[PDB]
Design a protein around this nucleic acid. Structure first.
Ligand SMILES: [Ca+2]
Ligand SMILES: [Ca+2]
Ligand SMILES: [Ca+2]
Length: 223
DNA sequence: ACGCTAGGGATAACCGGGTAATAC
DNA sequence: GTATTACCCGGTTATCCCTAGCGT
């Protein structure tokens, strides 16, 4: 075999790199299930060879969450998280962490569920067939948040920020969330765009499913 | 009198493209 | 000189959080 450490400094077209990539066949169960939530959430899955191979790009503010995701698909990620620091139009410095997998056919397994002809879509019964408690956990760590950010609140309502998807796509996601996980949720409007509102009634049932995957530095997102 | 929204803001993400390092 | 491609860019804004002030 070939160790990861031997190709953590070699160039992109390295012979030893390609032989290491041939040793890896598919994503493991944890990498696929989490991938679902990540692609629904904050991750970006892309092909440059028109569908032959795919890779995932990551960018987050939270260094620790970036570290956790990098460790997940450890064998798919060559480098440690890289730091950016950019100046925006106001003239403010913005600190963010970035990382990416190498391209590999194993990622086609994930991308074939979302990317159809360049543009990302959501299949009719995605949640019912593919979304697991682990998928919901990473999706929450990406898009999750509170409904009530007022200090001192009895409202334990969860929100999933899905402003990028169409109202139809989100409506279908709500159908899955209600049926598979018995969640009292529905679509709400924010900036003329859809979000998933989870009622405080289903908070216990939602928390129990995502407990065995949550990281401490992401516990602030919970009410 | 104050809980709870809808409205809003400066990000914290998401998109592709460019490049610099190997193979032949 | 052309193919390959992980790492690194810049464009750009929908995000997650914050809160005015509405509604009872
Ligand atoms: Ca997201
Ligand atoms: Ca996020
Ligand atoms: Ca976005």
């Amino acid at each position: 075999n070939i160790k990861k450490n031997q190709v953590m400094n070699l160039g992109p077209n390295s012979k030893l790199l390609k032989e290491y990539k041939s040793q890896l066949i598919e994503l493991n169960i944890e990498q696929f299930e989490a991938g679902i939530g990540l692609i629904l959430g904050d991750a970006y899955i892309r092909s440059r060879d028109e569908g032959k191979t795919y890779c995932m790009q990551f960018e987050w503010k939270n260094k620790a969450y970036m570290d956790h995701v990098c460790l997940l698909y450890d064998q798919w990620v060559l480098s440690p998280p890289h730091k950016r620091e950019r100046v925006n139009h106001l003239g403010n410095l913005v600190i963010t962490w970035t990382a990416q997998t190498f391209k590999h056919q194993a990622f086609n397994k994930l991308a074939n569920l979302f990317i159809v002809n360049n543009k990302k879509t959501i299949p009719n019964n995605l949640v019912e067939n593919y979304l697991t408690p682990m998928s919901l956990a990473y999706w929450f760590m990406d898009d999750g948040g509170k409904w009530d950010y007022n200090k001192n609140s009895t409202n334990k309502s969860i929100v999933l920020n899905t402003q990028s998807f169409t109202f139809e796509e989100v409506e279908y996601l709500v159908k899955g969330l209600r049926n598979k996980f018995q969640l009292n949720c529905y679509v709400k409007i924010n900036k003329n765009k859809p979000i998933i509102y989870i009622d405080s009634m289903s908070y216990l049932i939602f928390y129990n499913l995502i407990k065995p995957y949550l990281i401490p530095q992401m516990m602030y997102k919970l009410p």
